[PDB]
Amino acid sequence: ITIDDAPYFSALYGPARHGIVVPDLSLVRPHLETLEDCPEDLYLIEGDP
């Protein structure tokens, strides 16, 4: 993304800027209990990567 839209997008996505896109979010539900090694606040988003 260009420098002109960069500040807009960074404000829009806020803390979730560095989340992961995952199109279902139910396939993670079994994996999730295992996450003991991760940032204290993990963000997940659904959509076509």
Partner 1 sequence: SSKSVANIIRKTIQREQNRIRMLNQGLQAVSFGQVRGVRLNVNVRESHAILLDVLSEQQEQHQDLFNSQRLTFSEAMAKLYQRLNPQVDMGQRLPQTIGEELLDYRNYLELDVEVNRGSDGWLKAESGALSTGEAIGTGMSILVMVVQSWEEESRRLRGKDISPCRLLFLDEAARLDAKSIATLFELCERLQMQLIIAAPENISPEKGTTYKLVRKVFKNHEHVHVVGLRGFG
Contacts to partner 1 by CB under 8 A = 1-2, 4-5
Residue 8 or 13: the one with the smaller Cβ distance to partner 1 is 8
CB of 1 to partner 1, least distance (A): 8
**Please, what is the minimum distance in Å from the beta carbon of residue 2 to partner 1?**
5
The number of C-alpha atoms within 13 Å of 34 and in the hemisphere containing its C-beta is 4
CA angle 6, 37, 20 (to 5 degrees): 30
Token pair for 3: 């420098």
Instruction: Between 4 and 33, name the residue whose CB sits nearer to partner 1.
Output: 4
